[PDB]
C-alpha cells in the first residue's frame, strides 16, 4: 500500500519458473515483473540466478553463445531503463562459453550498470564443468541511501562470502539464487545467521517449480538484521514487495582469522 | 536409559548458577554434576564459562590470585579423575591477574589434561578490562572416537572461529558459555548455522539464573550437523545428557576468503 513513514526503500523480488534456453520467454517474465514492481512503488527488483536462460548449466555451456548472452544483457538493461526500476539479474558472463562464469549485475533505474560480480562458489560438478569461478570479492556500492552488495546462490551459504561484503560496508546484500531439492536449511537456518552475524539485511530470490529437471523450492525471502523474515514467499510464482526500515564486525579478530581458515 | 545401539558417545552438560568468588561452592556443584553424569553413563561433562569463580570478570581481575586459580584447577583435575569422567571446565588462565585470559581445558577420565585453549573473542569492556585475549586457534584432538575441539562463549558467534576448528578436523565442538540478557538469537539462530555450515555437532553449556548482577539465559543445548537440537534445557539448573549418533569445508575458496576478511 502507501509508502510508510520511516522507510524510504521498497524492494521487490521476482520468484518464477524459467524455460530452459528460451530467453524471450524468460526475459518477458522479468519485464512483466519489473512493470508490476514499479507499479507497486518498488525501487529495485531482484531476479533469480541464471533466469534468462534457465538454470541449465551444461546446456548453457553447450548451446548459448556469447552473442546470445550479450543480447539478453542488452534487453535487461533496457528493462531497467524502460520500467524505471533498478534491476539485479544473473546471466552467464560475457566471455566465450569456456571462459565465462555465472554473474550478477545491478542496473539502476536509468539503465546504468552500477556493479558486476562473478559467482566465487560454484555449486556441484555441473556448474564446475560449465563455468569458471570468480576471483574477486563482492562489490559494495551506494544506492538508495544504503550500501548494497551482490552475491550469487551458493555464495551466501559461506559465512566468509557475506563477511567479505559486510567488511566492505554492505548493509543490503542481494542474492539471485537457484535452490532445489527442498533445502530448507538455507533460508531457514543459514540466511538468518548471515544477517545476524553481520548485522545486515539479505534478499534471496529463487526459482520455483519444475525447471530443467529440478523442482525449485521457491521460498524467496528478505531477512532483516535480527534474522527475522521481513517478507517471504511459498512455492508458487510471485512478486515479494518489502519496505525496509554485539559489534561483530569490529570485534572479530580478522588478522588471526585469516591465518586460520 | 540404556546406552543405545549406534551410539558409543554419551555427553552431559551442566547448567547451573554459580556464586561469585566462592570456588568451594561452585566446584562442589561441578563435582555433584560429574558424579551424576557418570551415573547416567555419560563419558564427558561440559561445564560453563568461568563457573568456578562465577562470571564476575572485574572481580576476578581484582580479587582472584593465580594461586587461587591453580587450586581450583587442581580440584577440577581431581574431579575428572575421581568421578571417572572427561571434564571440560573454564577458569582464568594461570598467569598473573594482569596477564591471563579466559580459558577452557579438557581433562580425560583419568585426569590427564588433553587440551587447553584461551578465549580469542572477549565480550564487552569488562572482559577486555579483566583479561588478555587468546592468540591461538582452537585445539582439535581425538577422544572417544571423534575429533573434539574447544571454544569459549562469544567465540562461537563468529563463524571464523568455528570454521578454524572444523578446518583442523573438528567434529564435536564443546563450548562453555555465560549468556545473559535473553539473547535468543545465539542458540536459536547462530548455533544451528555453525553446525550446518561446517557439518559438525556443537555443545553449549550456559549458566542460568541470577549471578553476579546478571540473569543468565540457561538454554544449554547440543546441536547436530543438521542444525537440530539433540537436547536442550530451559532456564533452570539441570544436567542435559545426550547420546550422539554440501561439502562446505572442501568447497570453500579459503585462499581467496583469507584475503577478504
Ligand atoms: Cl572484503
Ligand atoms: Cl584452523
Q: Are B152 and B102 in contact (CB under 8 A)?
A: yes
Q: Which residue among A154, A189, A246 sits closest to B196, beta carbon to beta carbon? A: A189
Place of cell 581445558: B105
- Nearest CA to CA, how far is B110 from chain A (Å)? 31
* Resolution for the entry shown, Å: 1.5
Q: Are B104 and B89 in contact (CB under 8 A)?
A: yes
**Every domain of chain A and the residues it spans:** 1-261
Selection from B252, B194, B250 nearest residue B223 by Cα: B194
Q: Does B192 touch chain A (CB under 8 A)?
A: yes
Distance A167 CA to ligand 1 centre (A): 5
How many of the other CB atoms lie within 10 Å of CB of A237? 15
Residues of A with Cβ-Cβ distance to B248 under 8 angstroms: 157-158
Structure determined by: X-ray
Question: Do the strands A146-150 and A172-176 form a parallel or antiparallel pair, or are they unpaired?
Answer: parallel
Query: Cell numbers at residue A175, please?
Result: 542474492
Give me the numbers of helices (H) and strands (E) for chain A, helices first please: 9, 14
Q: Do A185 and B226 touch (CB under 8 A)?
A: yes
Q: Is A158 left (phi over 0), alpha (psi -120 to 50) or beta?
A: beta
Class at the top of the CATH hierarchy for domain B1-261: alpha beta
Q: Which residue among A123, A193, A253 sits closest to B193, beta carbon to beta carbon? A: A193
What's the half-sphere exposure (Cβ side, CA atoms, 13 Å) at A156? 33
Q: Do A252 and B121 touch (CB under 8 A)?
A: yes
Interatomic CA distance for residues A38 and B126, integer angstroms: 50
Distance B120 CA to ligand 1 centre (A): 21
Order of all β-strands in the sheet with A140-143: A140-143, A146-150, A172-176, A201-205, A221-223, A229-232
Q: Does A184 touch chain B (CB under 8 A)?
A: no
Q: Could you say which DSSP state residue B21 is in?
A: T
Interatomic CA distance for residues B207 and B246, integer angstroms: 34
How many of the other CB atoms lie within 10 Å of CB of A253? 19
Question: Do the strands A238-244 and A9-15 form a parallel or antiparallel pair, or are they unpaired?
Answer: antiparallel
Please give the distance of CA A241 from its chain centroid, rounded to a whole number. 15
Q: Do A121 and B159 touch (CB under 8 A)?
A: no
Q: Which residue among B133, B157, B164 sits closest to A248, beta carbon to beta carbon? A: B157
Residues of B with Cβ-Cβ distance to A251 under 8 angstroms: 121, 154
Spell out the residues 6+ positions from residue A150 whose beta carbon is closer than 8 angstroms to its own.
A88, A104, A105, A106, A115, A117, A138, A139, A173, A174, A175
Amino acid at each position: 500500500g502507501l509508502v510508510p513513514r520511516g522507510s524510504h526503500m521498497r524492494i521487490a523480488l521476482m520468484q518464477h519458473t524459467a524455460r530452459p534456453l528460451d530467453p524471450q520467454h524468460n526475459l518477458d517474465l522479468i519485464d512483466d515483473a519489473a512493470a508490476r514492481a514499479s507499479e507497486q512503488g518498488a525501487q529495485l527488483l531482484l531476479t533469480p540466478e541464471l533466469f534468462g536462460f534457465g538454470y541449465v548449466p551444461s546446456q548453457i555451456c553447450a548451446q548459448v553463445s556469447a552473442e546470445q548472452v550479450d543480447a539478453a544483457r542488452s534487453r535487461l538493461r533496457g528493462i531497467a531503463r524502460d520500467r524505471g526500476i533498478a534491476l539485479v539479474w544473473s546471466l552467464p558472463g560475457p566471455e566465450g562459453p569456456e571462459q565465462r562464469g555465472i554473474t550478477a549485475e545491478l542496473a539502476d533505474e536509468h539503465g546504468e550498470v552500477l556493479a558486476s560480480y562473478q559467482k566465487v562458489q560454484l555449486y556441484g560438478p555441473e556448474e564446475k564443468a560449465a563455468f569458471v569461478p570468480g576471483e574477486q570479492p563482492p562489490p559494495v556500492l551506494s544506492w538508495g541511501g544504503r550500501q548494497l552488495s551482490l552475491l550469487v546462490a551458493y555464495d551466501v551459504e559461506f559465512p566468509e562470502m557475506v563477511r567479505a561484503a559486510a567488511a566492505r560496508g554492505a548493509q543490503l546484500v542481494l542474492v539471485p539464487t537457484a535452490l532445489a531439492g527442498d533445502e530448507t536449511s538455507v533460508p531457514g537456518i543459514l540466511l538468518p545467521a548471515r544477517a545476524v552475524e553481520n548485522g545486515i539485511t539479505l534478499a534471496y530470490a529463487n526459482h520455483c517449480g519444475p525447471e530443467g529437471g529440478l523442482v525449485f523450492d521457491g521460498g524467496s525471502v528478505v531477512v532483516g538484521p535480527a534474522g527475522q523474515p521481513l517478507g517471504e514467499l511459498g512455492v508458487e510464482p510471485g512478486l515479494l514487495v518489502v519496505d525496509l526500515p554485539a559489534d561483530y564486525l569490529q570485534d572479530r579478530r580478522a588478522e588471526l582469522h585469516r591465518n586460520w581458515l
